[PDB]
Each structure stands twice: as structure tokens, then as C-alpha cells.
Ligand binder design. Sequence first.
Ligand SMILES: Nc1nc2c(ncn2[C@H]2CC[C@@H](COP(=O)(O)OP(=O)(O)OP(=O)(O)O)O2)c(=O)[nH]1
Length: 534
Amino acid sequence: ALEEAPWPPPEGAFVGFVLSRKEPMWADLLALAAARGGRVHRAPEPYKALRDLKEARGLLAKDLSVLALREGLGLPPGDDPMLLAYLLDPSNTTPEGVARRYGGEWTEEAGERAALSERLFANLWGRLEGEERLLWLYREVERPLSAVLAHMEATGVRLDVAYLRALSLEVAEEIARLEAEVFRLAGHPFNLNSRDQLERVLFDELGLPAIGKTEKTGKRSTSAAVLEALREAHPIVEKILQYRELTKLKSTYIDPLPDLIHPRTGRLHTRFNQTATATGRLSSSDPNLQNIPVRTPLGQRIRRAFIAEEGWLLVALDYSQIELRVLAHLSGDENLIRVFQEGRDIHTETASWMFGVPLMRRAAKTINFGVLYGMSAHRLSQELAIPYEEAQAFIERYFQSFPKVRAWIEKTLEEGRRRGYVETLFGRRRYVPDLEARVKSVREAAERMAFNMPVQGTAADLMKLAMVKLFPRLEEMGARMLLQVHDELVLEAPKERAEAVARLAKEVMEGVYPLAVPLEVEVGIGEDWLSAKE
DNA sequence: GACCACGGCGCG
DNA sequence: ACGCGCCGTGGTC
Ligand SMILES: Nc1nc2c(ncn2[C@H]2CC[C@@H](COP(=O)(O)OP(=O)(O)OP(=O)(O)O)O2)c(=O)[nH]1
């Protein structure tokens, strides 16, 4: 810092850069700087100076690296103080917060940013000393991962624009039809997009019972859950739910996506955020490609839009019940571990209401998804369509079949209260203080956040590690990693190597880290994201 | 134009 | 009575 010294910087310096916007793929490089040995180096011309650097180290290294790859420059990201802070406390998600917290100030000048990166790393890195397990995550997962992610953000994914443009016109017509029908029943036109106007119409201008109310402002809710219960109580309801689906997918996916194709690449680029979640998961944004619809017919039509480059094929890899398996391993429950040991499908195997294996099943498929979150009979009976206590009775059979689960939940909650945090299999930790709150609702909310983190975070660790190990193997085969959706990966491979890439990636993922239970991966190849599954 | 809270909903 | 990001609305600055 302080002493201004001419560019270029000495090797191994901390970089501070300024972008016109957050998205590195769309951002103009306004300023570039570096700091080292107590010196500040401000580049005369940012874009040119980019060539000098050998690797990116400093706050938000990956982003600068992404922009570098955009310009043909092979500039890999390295140390990033944000990554260290994220490992100390996953609540450290922003440079504004991190700086303020560890001896600095997040500015709009590259030099002060570069200097902030230098001292911020010194301090933070010191706080990580002794934390063997965290250091291991930083070196063996986080740091290397930042590079893999940088290459995914720069590669982007191919989108069938004309297809979506056409789908938009068809959906527009169907929306108009539902709009006219709803207005007819309402006896008058209003903003069907306005849940406020909808509330008045539904519960006041109609004999419709208000089931629940909104959290913050306490209005009569018009959530899908509420409307579901009223689907028979009125024709207009079903038409409103259908209107909801269409408008949701049209305004969020169908319309905005085509307009996001990058001019240089001709592909769709998302940002994979590394210090965003409280559990250790990745997040996707601008645009979010981890929530592309798939569960409904209309959603699946949208998913077909994501296609492979010509001469290429999409390879889709999904872990199967990875969080359940993580639980089986974390808890040590034999009667569960031995369900994945025998390769026996849990949902039907845990369909032990009587004996499989084989009738009421899928009621367990929702119990298994449900135990991870700590859902009670209410969310259960409602989503399963059964009496309130024809749901409670269920949940208790579960803890009797799998006692070691309850024991683990109990275990970690106790651990959490004591030291103030919980952790994953690899020692990634999340601080959750409200475990000692005197208000039950608040405390029981903290508890759910608390015992879910180790499970969801461990699965995140496994996927991350699997990506770090899988990446180099893909480069050697001229294949590329496109997207990650928490428990699934999407690769793009040349048709010829497609099947080879598929088999390899599968094994890299199944053996990423052996547990007291085998990890199972489903693999699919196709010209589009949808067909690449099944 | 920007950013906001909110209700709502897409995905794992 | 889990984890995210984005939409339109309604609203402010
Ligand atoms: N984490 C999470 N994932 C969900 C939820 N609802 C749906 N999904 C996604 C995750 C994977 C997929 C369900 O995968 P399963 O583990 O049921 O495996 P499957 O192939 O669907 O088996 P089956 O067809 O027998 O249900 O749907 C949810 O509430 N939480």
C-alpha cells in the first residue's frame, strides 16, 4: 500500500479491479491494480495490463478470471480472502461485510481494493491457522473449485432461441384465454398479477374461505397451497393456478432467457457464487440456471431449449438420494445403511407401513424428503392429502424404524448449543446461535436450520470435491463442464467421446469419497437437457 | 432510473 | 408449526 509504484507488479501480488457491473461476462474492466511488498501498482490501461498477471489472487478472484477467459487469456484464480472468510463463518458472503469485519473498507478504487486484498488476506489467513480441517477445505476444494467454476461461467450453455421465441407466442395466447375466463367468473377485469387485487376478489367478492395469512403483513394468502385446498370450492381457482404456472414460467424463463445470449460466445452464461449460501452449497445468478423448470409439462418444454453444441452431446449426471445417504453415514443407522448396502430402494423399503416390497409408497418418498427439513404433521398431511393424525402416526413409525437418526439429530443439536455451531462431515461449520432462544418458534426454527446444515452441507462438499477431481479429467478428453445443480452435473462432450465421458464422470462421482454407504449416480446422454435425462 | 419489501414460486 | 434467486406488485427516492 501507500507507495505508488509503476506497473507491472512483482509476481504474486494481490489484484484489485473495478467492473462496470457485477457480471464478469458482461462487465467492462474499468480499473486494474496490484499490491505487494507494501506497494500499489495501478495499470495505465486495464485490459492491456491483464496480460501481465500470471494468476488472479484477491477479493473476487474468480470473477476477474472469468473476464480474463472471456478475452482469450488463460488467467487462473488463486487465493481469495472471501473464500477464507466464508470458511470461518458462512455468513461472510460480501466484501462489504468481510472488509469491515477484518480490518478494511470495500471501495470503488482498484488500488485500495488491491491493498484491502493484501491486508485482508494476511489477517484472515492467520485466523485459519490451527484450523486443519478448514485449511484442508480451502486448499483441496474451495481454492481449486474457484478455477473450475471460472471455466464453467466462461463456457456458458447453448440455448435454442428461436424455439423459445415461438414458445412465447403460444403461451401468450393460452395466458390470454385463462385471463378472459377468470375475468368472466370474477364478473370484471382486474390485475390478475396483483395478489392484493386477487385477494379482494377471491375472499370478499366471493364466498371463498381465507385459509391462511401472509407472514409479514398478515394479508389473506393466495399462495398455491391455499388455492389447492380451494380447487373444488370454485372453478375460478383452478384457472388461477393454471394462470400462475404459465405467467411464472413465461416472465421468469421463456422471455428473459433469449435476451441473455452473449454476442461473442452465442451462449448463455450464469454466475456460480461461491460465498453465497449458509450451508456450503453453490448458488447461481444472472441468470439463475439452478432453477430451470422441469416438474411440469410446460417446464419440460422450456428445458428442451438447453441443447448441446452441434457435433456435441449433453451428459447429465445425478446423485441419487445423496442427502439421505449422507444421513445414513452421519447418523450410523444400521437399518438405513443396510438399505443402501443392499442397493434396495429406500422409498419402497422404508415403505414399511406394513411390508413391501409396495402399495402406499411415495408417501415415504415425501417423508424421506421431509425428515431432512424437520417438517411436522401439518406440512405432511397437507402435501400427502390425508388426516392430520393419519400423518403424525406416520412420522413416528419412521423414528422407530430408524432410531439412530433421532439420536444424531439430538446429538448435533446438543453439540450446536455447546460450541455455538454445527459442521459437515468435512468440518465446514455454520454458526447458529438461536439454538438457545427463549421463544420456542424461534428456537425450533434455529434447530431445523441447525441439523439440516450438516446434511445439506456435506452433500455440497461431496459434489464440490467431485467437480474439482472431475474437471482435469474432462479437459484431457476435450470435454467441458457446463452446469451444476446441487446434486447433479451437466457436461458437454464430443459425440465420439460422449459415452466415454459419461462412464468416467459417473465413476469419478460415485467414488469421490467412500462412505458407510455407496454413492449412486444416474447418467444420461442427449441433444438437450431434458432428453439427457431418463 | 434505482433500490425496497413482500408474496409467491422455480429448483435441489 | 431446509437452502437459494427472480418475478411483478406496490412503494419510495
Ligand atoms: N432436496 C429436494 N429435492 C427435491 C424435492 N422435491 C423434488 N426434488 C427433486 C430432487 C431429486 C428428485 C427426486 O429424486 P428421488 O430421490 O425421489 O429419486 P427418483 O429417481 O425420483 O425416485 P422415484 O422416481 O422413485 O421418486 O426430485 C425437495 O423437496 N427437496
